[PDB]
Design a protein around this ligand. Sequence first.
Ligand SMILES: *[C@@H]1O[C@H](CO)[C@@H](O[C@@H]2O[C@H](CO)[C@@H](O)[C@H](O)[C@H]2NC(C)=O)[C@H](O[C@@H]2O[C@@H](C)[C@@H](O)[C@@H](O)[C@@H]2O)[C@H]1NC(C)=O
Ligand SMILES: *[C@@H]1O[C@H](CO)[C@@H](O[C@@H]2O[C@H](CO)[C@@H](O)[C@H](O)[C@H]2NC(C)=O)[C@H](O[C@@H]2O[C@@H](C)[C@@H](O)[C@@H](O)[C@@H]2O)[C@H]1NC(C)=O
Ligand SMILES: *[C@@H]1O[C@H](CO)[C@@H](O[C@@H]2O[C@H](CO)[C@@H](O)[C@H](O)[C@H]2NC(C)=O)[C@H](O[C@@H]2O[C@@H](C)[C@@H](O)[C@@H](O)[C@@H]2O)[C@H]1NC(C)=O
Ligand SMILES: *[C@@H]1O[C@H](CO)[C@@H](O)[C@H](O[C@@H]2O[C@@H](C)[C@@H](O)[C@@H](O)[C@@H]2O)[C@H]1NC(C)=O
Ligand SMILES: [Ca+2]
Ligand SMILES: [Ca+2]
Ligand SMILES: [Mn+2]
Ligand SMILES: [Mn+2]
Lengths: 237, 237
Amino acid sequence: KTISFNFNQFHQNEEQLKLQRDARISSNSVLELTKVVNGVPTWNSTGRALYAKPVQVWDSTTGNVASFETRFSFSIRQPFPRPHPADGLVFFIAPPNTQTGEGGGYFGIYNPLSPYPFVAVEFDTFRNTWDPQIPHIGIDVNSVISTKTVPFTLDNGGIANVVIKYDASTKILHVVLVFPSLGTIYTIADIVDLKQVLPESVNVGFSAATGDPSGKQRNATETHDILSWSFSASLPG
Amino acid sequence: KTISFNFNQFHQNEEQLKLQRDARISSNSVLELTKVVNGVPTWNSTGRALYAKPVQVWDSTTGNVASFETRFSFSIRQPFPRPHPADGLVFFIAPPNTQTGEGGGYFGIYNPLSPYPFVAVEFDTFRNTWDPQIPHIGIDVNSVISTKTVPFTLDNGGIANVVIKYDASTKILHVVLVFPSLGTIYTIADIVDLKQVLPESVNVGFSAATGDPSGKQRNATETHDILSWSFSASLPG
Ligand SMILES: *[C@@H]1O[C@H](CO)[C@@H](O[C@@H]2O[C@H](CO)[C@@H](O)[C@H](O)[C@H]2NC(C)=O)[C@H](O[C@@H]2O[C@@H](C)[C@@H](O)[C@@H](O)[C@@H]2O)[C@H]1NC(C)=O
Ligand SMILES: *[C@@H]1O[C@H](CO)[C@@H](O[C@@H]2O[C@H](CO)[C@@H](O)[C@H](O)[C@H]2NC(C)=O)[C@H](O[C@@H]2O[C@@H](C)[C@@H](O)[C@@H](O)[C@@H]2O)[C@H]1NC(C)=O
Ligand SMILES: *[C@@H]1O[C@H](CO)[C@@H](O[C@@H]2O[C@H](CO)[C@@H](O)[C@H](O)[C@H]2NC(C)=O)[C@H](O[C@@H]2O[C@@H](C)[C@@H](O)[C@@H](O)[C@@H]2O)[C@H]1NC(C)=O
Ligand SMILES: *[C@@H]1O[C@H](CO)[C@@H](O)[C@H](O[C@@H]2O[C@@H](C)[C@@H](O)[C@@H](O)[C@@H]2O)[C@H]1NC(C)=O
Ligand SMILES: [Ca+2]
Ligand SMILES: [Ca+2]
Ligand SMILES: [Mn+2]
Ligand SMILES: [Mn+2]
């Protein structure tokens, strides 16, 4: 059983996508996860976009787990450098029908008063009390406190290509981040057992957030645009 | 005990490299693993290049294993597409003082008469009886029958960027192959316990080969050039 989808661009009112909070699709085909007014990003914004249909990552009848691959391009533009850009974006896997959690350093995927499991790959731009030097790529399992982290230099306003691959036989989640204009390549990988953290069916998508009001800084913002996205999953069981 | 070297270009008579068989450094600074006469690659060629100093990947006293990262660019030019180019190149890790093995599909790293252990990342261009479709990236442990494989499409005569990273804490060996001119990214990973297969001290280097005469095809050839190479290893012990 295989499932796959591809988005060369994003059309307004895409029946295949589920938009939440501030997420919006521009007229120029970009998925803007967080609020951008008159070409300027704002703080206190959170937005998510999930693939409309649930995907089965494992089967309890056979115990088999899915292998998958996803590729996407994103762009993070940071207009106001001085204070500190925030917060970042993530590709994530969670139980179906979840609601946007806390914004800010929680990217909109963590809800303290009713936590739901999740596996996420973050592109963190703001250093929270629990983070190492930013920006960094991180593998998150149920917590925004990454199991593994790798720093990277952002191509401000530039395009970044990401490849996330999960091999069930080895339980390896490997991610590649490339900035074609800079010729830089970043890599990180960790062992993650999906069967141990997630339910059989899940939702895959993105979530991003800009500076939270509590920070008292309106400049703590940036764009979190997804330009294209393909997904392929294979469940033998 | 960290160690690292970096070759942004190769100079003839590199005191740092040990060249074996047909391996040679061209005037314009590129490391030609296999024979190329008058700008034309030939069959029946095999060559290797090893860093002259042995590196310690693990220590029996503390038991600690080294974590390392290596980056290099190569270029395979396939002048004759019709029959079938051969054979490919590999980055390998082996015991010090070994000699070039069999050519052809053995890339010059495997010796049937007296096999020595090794861990290699291959870039396979010819399909042998034990191979899946070509070209493919492959992780090889003590043999040329990859534990893990992934297909890729070669950028003929183009530049390829490679990142090989080994994390001792997880035992994950992850490799990334990027063709900047095509924008394509290929990734593969597997679990390898260096301690279980290799001695404490080893040699790191490259090996390549063109079509073996036994195939009776003079067109089974291609270049196998290395343009640059950096290596970094950190043994916490
Ligand atoms: C928030 O971003 C603004 C735009 O980048 C900052 O203002 C810019 O500050 C520059 C000097 O740091 C100055 O050359 C630019 O002209 C100015 N741009 C604009 C459109 O105002 C702003 O910096 C604060 O406000 C300015 C006016 C100065 O007083 C700075 O000393 C202030 O830090 C940023 N605000 C914060 C919280 O840093
Ligand atoms: C493939 O390359 C081999 C080089 O490693 C050639 O081996 C030959 O081995 C001889 C034994 O000591 C040596 O004198 C020769 O110099 C060398 N080849 C050359 C440059 O003449 C091999 O050559 C073939 O096999 C040898 C044994 C002779 O019969 C040659 O006349 C053959 O051409 C190369 N094979 C082919 C088919 O080109
Ligand atoms: C070995 O590689 C050669 C270089 O591509 C092939 O020759 C080329 O074949 C083309 C059509 O096959 C032809 O248009 C080219 O003019 C020719 N180039 C040269 C310099 O020979 C060769 O192809 C075979 O052998 C040649 C001599 C011709 O008879 C072709 O018709 C044959 O297909 C390749 N040989 C093999 C083993 O395929
Ligand atoms: C941050 O976003 C929330 C949700 O989009 C808004 O409700 C907030 O706007 C207004 O001010 C806050 C303090 C609260 O009273 C809310 O109910 C209001 O709508 C917004 N807060 C900021 C800092 O603008
Ligand atoms: Ca953060
Ligand atoms: Ca082969
Ligand atoms: Mn973080
Ligand atoms: Mn192979």
